[PDB]
Structure formats: C-alpha cells, structure tokens
Design a protein around this ligand. Structure first.
Ligand SMILES: *[C@@H]1O[C@H](CO)[C@@H](O[C@@H]2O[C@H](CO)[C@@H](O)[C@H](O)[C@H]2NC(C)=O)[C@H](O)[C@H]1NC(C)=O
Ligand SMILES: *[C@@H]1O[C@H](CO)[C@@H](O[C@@H]2O[C@H](CO)[C@@H](O)[C@H](O)[C@H]2NC(C)=O)[C@H](O)[C@H]1NC(C)=O
Ligand SMILES: *[C@@H]1O[C@H](CO)[C@@H](O[C@@H]2O[C@H](CO)[C@@H](O)[C@H](O)[C@H]2NC(C)=O)[C@H](O)[C@H]1NC(C)=O
Ligand SMILES: *[C@@H]1O[C@H](CO)[C@@H](O[C@@H]2O[C@H](CO)[C@@H](O)[C@H](O)[C@H]2NC(C)=O)[C@H](O)[C@H]1NC(C)=O
Ligand SMILES: *[C@@H]1O[C@H](CO)[C@@H](O[C@@H]2O[C@H](CO)[C@@H](O)[C@H](O)[C@H]2NC(C)=O)[C@H](O)[C@H]1NC(C)=O
Ligand code: NAG
Lengths: 50, 170, 106, 7
C-alpha cells in the first residue's frame, strides 16, 4: 500500500476560541542509548603469522 | 558478466558482501535520518479554510492549492534552485509526502502553537500565541496587542524579503 | 529532548553496554473549548493577565493558568492595566473585582 | 489591608 503519514486532525481554529486542558497524564517513556562497545585487542603478528 | 573474473574474485572472500552490507546500512541510515527529521508528528494537521490570523500572512509558506505538487512557493523555488552496477534506491519518503509533513508541522505550529508537540493539539488564536511567545522572551502581552498591526506588517515584509533574497541569490 | 511532552524528570537505568532513560513527562488531557479574549475592558481601562489567560464558559469570564483549567475571578491581583480599550483589537467588556472594595465599604 | 480599614 501507499503509506499513510498519519491520521488526519483538522484543528478547529478560530480567532476567539481556545482549548484549555482540564486533566493530565503522567507519562513515562523509554529511551535506549548505547554507551560503549566491546574492547577488542588484536595481536597483529599473532593474527597474521601465529 | 565474466565468469572467470568472478571465479578469481571468489579467492578474496567476502569483500563484496562487506561492501554491500555497508552500502545497505548507509541507505537505511538515510531513511532513518529522514524519519527522525521530518516524521515527528503522527497527526496530519490542516489549516482552516479562512485565513484569519489577525493580520499575519502565511501564503508564502503554506502549500499552494493551485500547484499540482502541493508545495509552497518558497519550497517550489527551493526545488527549482537545486539541480555498470550502480543503482539509485528511491527514498522512503517521497517529495510530496515530505511537503505534506512540513504542511502538517506548519498547521500545528500556526493553529496550536507548541501544544501539539507535547500532546494533543490545543487550539489558540495566533495573536494570543504570539503574546505567549512574547512572554517567553520576557515582553508583556500589552506591547504585542497594541502594536499587532505593525508586528504583522513587519513579519509579512520580512517573509517577502526572504523570498526575494532566495530568488535573487544563486 | 527528554521525552514526549512537557518534561518533569528522568531516571537512569544501567543496561549492557548502554543506558535507559525513563522520562517522566506531563501530558495535557481532557481539553475543553472556551471563548477567549486578549484583554478585558473595564472603566475605560484595558486589563491583561499577569500570568494566565481570560476564558469564558459561555456566560461568565474567568482567568486561569495556561496549562490547566482553574477558573478564578478576574481581579486586580492577577491582572495589570496598560492603556485604554481603543487600541486592543477584540477587547470585550467585563467587570473587574476589587478585593479592597468590600473593605472600605464596611 | 487589615490595619487599614481598622483605622
Ligand atoms: C482526570 O483523569 C483521571 C484518570 O487519569 C481520573 O481519575 C479516574 O476517575 C474515575 C472517576 O472519577 C475513577 O473511576 C478512576 O478510577 C480514576 N482513575 C485513576 C487512575 O485514579 C480523574 O477523575 C480525572 N479528573 C477530572 C477532573 O476529570
Ligand atoms: C497574503 O499575501 C499574498 C501574497 O503575498 C496576497 O496575495 C496577493 O493579493 C493581491 C491582491 O488580492 C494580488 O494582486 C496578488 O497577485 C496576490 N499575490 C499572490 C502571490 O497570490 C494576499 O492577498 C495576502 N492576504 C491574504 C489574506 O491572503
Ligand atoms: C470545540 O469546538 C469545535 C467546533 O465545533 C469542535 O470541533 C468539532 O468536533 C466534532 C466532534 O468531534 C466534529 O464532528 C466536528 O467535525 C468538529 N468541527 C470542526 C470544525 O473541527 C471541537 O470538538 C470542540 N472541542 C471540544 C473539546 O469540545
Ligand atoms: C460558568 O461558570 C460559572 C461558575 O460556576 C457559572 O455560574 C454559576 O452557575 C450556576 C448554575 O446554576 C449557578 O447556580 C451559580 O449561582 C452561578 N454562579 C454565579 C456566581 O453566578 C455559570 O453558569 C457558567 N456558565 C455556563 C454557560 O456554563
Ligand atoms: C463596551 O463599553 C463601551 C463603553 O463603556 C462601549 O462603547 C460605546 O459604544 C457605543 C455604541 O457603539 C457608543 O455610542 C459610545 O459612545 C461608546 N462609548 C465609549 C466610551 O466608547 C462599547 O460599545 C462596549 N462594547 C460592547 C461589545 O458592548
Ligand atoms: C473574528 O472573526 C469574526 C468573523 O466572524 C469577526 O466578526 C471578529 O471581529 C473577529 N475578531 C477579531 C478580534 O479579529
């Protein structure tokens, strides 16, 4: 299929109307970030030549 | 298409697999970059049909309905100003969908301010949003409201000067 | 930068060769329409909110904080006066309560 | 305001 970018949401804009929240959600989200790699050492003489 | 050349190339091992894997990683990294930059909203916001923004003109940055590409005049000018085993993979997001993403972001930041970036899109009048931004930089609302026509005129003049500068500088 | 929504706090967690950030954020919800005005015209003076916004539920005008609905009576303690009503576009007529007004009456 | 209206 052709991918839909998102659901359509027509904001009801007018020059004298505002939307004020009456409630809230305490939302916890995860963010995973790599920090380090495996520290590898190669003996060049032993690898190439044994 | 030489079979003997490929037979000699097989003596060198998996170099070709490494190069194809690296190029595939670059190719998916470009699509990941485009997703990270442009696909930050899951709602496709639309501007109202009536462009009553308290004197602020956004026609130079909103998409033109008359154009088949659905691009803004500034974006159309930007697209006009940019000109053996190799293949070019198409990007995951096409140009019209990227323009649609920018249009959704423009509609969100015009009709809702910064509220759509933190949750549901909360509508607010654009002069009130500009007053909120004025309060963010420490300027009182009255200064914005008293000189609203001057601020809208300066913004429109600056946008026109931006379009002229882009059209006049190679 | 620190999660989707208005960032409140974050918690770090160790991971094999990595870190996991638990972002605790505030998301607005259950929004309601209100009729808004830039300023309130009272006694030939323009009143502007000191930190909030003027809202109307249909018959009465209140002032509330921008990120949460908490309607309060429009007084001189949460508003400030700058200029008359002839300059601000869209200013509406409403009364402004004075807390000192019942004091000198009694 | 409390000492003000008292006097
Ligand atoms: C704001 O939303 C919370 C939910 O996040 C509401 O809390 C619920 O209230 C109903 C009825 O009042 C209860 O049956 C639920 O058990 C409550 N949920 C939780 C998690 O406590 C709260 O009432 C809402 N407040 C307003 C003013 O709308
Ligand atoms: C916003 O700006 C656009 C262009 O910057 C205005 O469109 C012009 O309108 C005049 C008079 O109607 C025409 O002579 C021009 O040819 C129009 N230019 C373009 C590029 O369309 C527009 O009127 C302004 N105001 C609003 C409310 O959109
Ligand atoms: C604020 O008012 C607008 C205008 O009526 C509401 O938008 C309408 O919502 C209904 C119900 O979902 C839709 O059927 C209409 O198509 C909407 N109209 C427009 C122009 O968008 C909006 O829902 C109201 N907001 C609240 C929180 O009640
Ligand atoms: C807007 O909110 C105010 C504050 O609650 C409402 O005023 C009250 O309405 C109830 C409804 O019966 C009356 O019993 C109270 O006496 C009213 N209070 C005052 C101080 O007059 C008002 O009705 C609301 N308006 C709308 C359209 O919902
Ligand atoms: C808000 O009040 C002012 C006056 O307190 C109103 O201004 C008057 O408007 C009438 C009719 O337009 C004129 O005949 C008067 O000369 C005006 N007086 C002043 C002092 O300007 C204004 O119309 C009111 N606004 C609303 C929406 O009712
Ligand atoms: C808002 O738009 C309406 C058009 O229906 C107009 O009558 C009104 O004066 C406008 N108000 C402001 C403050 O621009």
């Amino acid at each position: 299929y052709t991918m839909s970018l998102g659901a359509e949401n027509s904001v009801a804009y007018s020059n004298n109307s505002i939307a004020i929240p009456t409630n809230f959600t305490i939302s916890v989200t995860t963010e995973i970030l790599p920090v380090s790699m495996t520290k590898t050492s190669v003996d060049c003489t032993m690898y190439i030549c044994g | 298409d030489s079979t003997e050349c490929s037979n000699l190339l097989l003596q060198y091992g998996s170099f070709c697999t490494q190069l194809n894997r690296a190029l595939t990683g670059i190719a998916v990294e470009q699509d990941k970059n485009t997703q990270e930059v442009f696909a930050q909203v899951k709602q496709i916001y639309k501007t109202p049909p009536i462009k009553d923004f308290g004197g602020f003109n956004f026609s130079q940055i909103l998409p033109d309905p008359s154009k088949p590409s659905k691009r803004s005049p500034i974006e159309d000018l930007l697209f006009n100003k940019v000109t053996n085993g190799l293949t070019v993979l198409p990007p995951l997001l096409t140009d019209e969908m990227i323009a649609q993403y920018t249009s959704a972001l423009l509609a969100g930041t015009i009709t809702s301010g910064w509220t759509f970036g933190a949750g549901p899109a909360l509508q607010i009048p654009f002069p009130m949003q500009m007053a909120y931004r004025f309060n963010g930089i420490g300027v009182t609302q009255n200064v914005l409201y008293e000189n609203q026509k001057l601020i809208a005129n300066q913004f429109n003049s600056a946008i026109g000067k931006i379009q002229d500068s882009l059209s006049s500088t190679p | 930068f620190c999660g989707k929504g208005y960032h409140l706090m974050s918690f770090p967690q160790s991971a094999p060769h990595g870190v996991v950030f638990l972002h605790v954020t505030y998301v607005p919800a259950h929004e309601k329409n209100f009729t808004t005005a830039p300023a309130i015209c009272h006694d030939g003076k323009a009143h502007f909110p000191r930190e909030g916004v003027f809202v109307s539920n249909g018959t009465h005008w209140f002032v509330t904080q921008r990120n949460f609905y908490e309607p309060q009576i429009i007084t001189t303690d949460n508003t400030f006066v700058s200029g008359n009503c002839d300059v601000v576009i869209g200013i509406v007529n409403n009364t402004v309560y004075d807390p000192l007004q019942p004091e000198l009456d009694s």
